């Protein structure tokens, strides 16, 4: 199943991006006066609300590499959601042409 390979890998990729992104955000934001994304617990929640595109604004990067990490977290969460949605649609379609009599 190709659609389950792409969705399954993207979700694994997303988890790696969320954890590494939380780590790399703190590493890139510290050293910049005024930054508030400087502790791992709340940086872990920031990566989730970034990947899900919620983006409250309570937490955000101010540096270049912090923003580059943010972009990666944005793209990873969006593409993973696009692949899973696509994989679900083909799963339902193939399931629907079955149950009738089409294999």
């Amino acid at each position: 199943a190709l659609h389950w390979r792409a969705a399954g890998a993207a979700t694994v990729l997303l988890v790696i991006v969320l954890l590494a992104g939380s780590y790399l955000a703190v590493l890139a934001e510290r050293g910049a006066p005024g930054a508030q994304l400087i502790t791992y617990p709340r940086a872990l929640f920031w990566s989730v609300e970034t990947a899900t595109t919620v983006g409250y604004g309570d937490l955000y990067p101010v540096t270049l590499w912090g923003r580059l990490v943010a972009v990666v977290v944005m793209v990873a969460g969006i593409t993973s959601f696009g692949l899973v949605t696509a994989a679900l649609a083909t799963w339902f379609v193939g399931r629907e042409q079955e149950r009738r009599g089409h294999f």
């Epitope: 590493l27 050293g31 006066p33 930054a35 508030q36």
Partner: antibody, heavy 118, light 108 residues
Framework: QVQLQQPGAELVKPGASVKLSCKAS????????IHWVKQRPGHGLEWIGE????????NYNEKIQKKATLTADKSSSTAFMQLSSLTSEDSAVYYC???????????WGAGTTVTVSS | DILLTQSPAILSVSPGERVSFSCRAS??????IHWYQQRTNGSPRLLIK???ESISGIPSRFSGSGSGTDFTLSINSVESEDIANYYC?????????FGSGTKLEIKR
């Protein structure tokens, strides 16, 4: 079981340098930050800089003059601070502290009494 | 950066009396304040992390409160071992800063 072990004291000639150490026992996570705090006799706590040994990146206090250079050795779990070009104004007690990346200093060292005199 | 002002410099109190130190920040820092104790010729010791939450090993005598720009460390019934220097530290913004400190003295 002192988590952060520092030498007792260090004597430095005016204008010379010294390499302070901070051997770390206990749990050593990849999210650990080692902070260095300067304290003069009869004075308060002053933040010098931080370093994450798992990555090797260090930040410093911009409001003061850069006298320190932070390094680390993951194989021996020991962070180092290089105080260069010392005067009498650099004579103080230097602590090292371990932060779990959650903001607070959970454990402190005994402090190293650095004296700059001829 | 964020300056932390501690008042008063020296705090006199009678034994068995509830005392309170004050830590105030230049700007709103939520609850990201931490309290430390330093006795004579000793190293700082964490008493309170994140304004109100306690630390294992530290007596229930110590308690903290406040948010925004006004923080308070209280001691129910001060005894002799409480005589030390108390500092507050913020972790809301980079860089971490310390308070000027408050010395506690007991009027026995």
């Amino acid at each position: 079981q002192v988590q952060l072990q520092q030498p007792g004291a260090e004597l430095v000639k005016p204008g010379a340098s010294v390499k302070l150490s901070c051997k770390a026992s206990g749990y050593t996570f990849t999210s650990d930050w080692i902070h260095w705090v300067k304290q003069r006799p009869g004075h308060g706590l002053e933040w010098i800089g931080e370093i994450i040994p798992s990555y090797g990146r260090a930040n410093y206090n911009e409001k003061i003059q850069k006298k320190a250079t932070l390094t680390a050795d993951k194989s021996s779990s020991t962070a180092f601070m290089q105080l260069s070009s010392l005067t009498s104004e650099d004579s103080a007690v230097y602590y090292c502290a371990r932060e779990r990346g959650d903001g607070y200093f959970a454990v402190w060292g005994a402090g190293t009494t650095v004296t700059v005199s001829s | 950066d964020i300056l932390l002002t501690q008042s008063p410099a020296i705090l006199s109190v009678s034994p068995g009396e509830r005392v309170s130190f004050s830590c105030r920040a230049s700007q709103s820092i939520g609850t990201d304040i931490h309290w430390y104790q330093q006795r004579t010729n000793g190293s700082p010791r964490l008493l309170i992390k994140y304004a109100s939450e306690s630390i294992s090993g530290i007596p229930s005598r110590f308690s903290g409160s406040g948010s925004g720009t006004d923080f308070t460390l209280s001691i129910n019934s001060v005894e002799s071992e409480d005589i030390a220097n108390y500092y507050c530290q913020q972790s809301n913004r980079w860089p971490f800063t310390f308070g000027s400190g408050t010395k506690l003295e007991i009027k026995r």
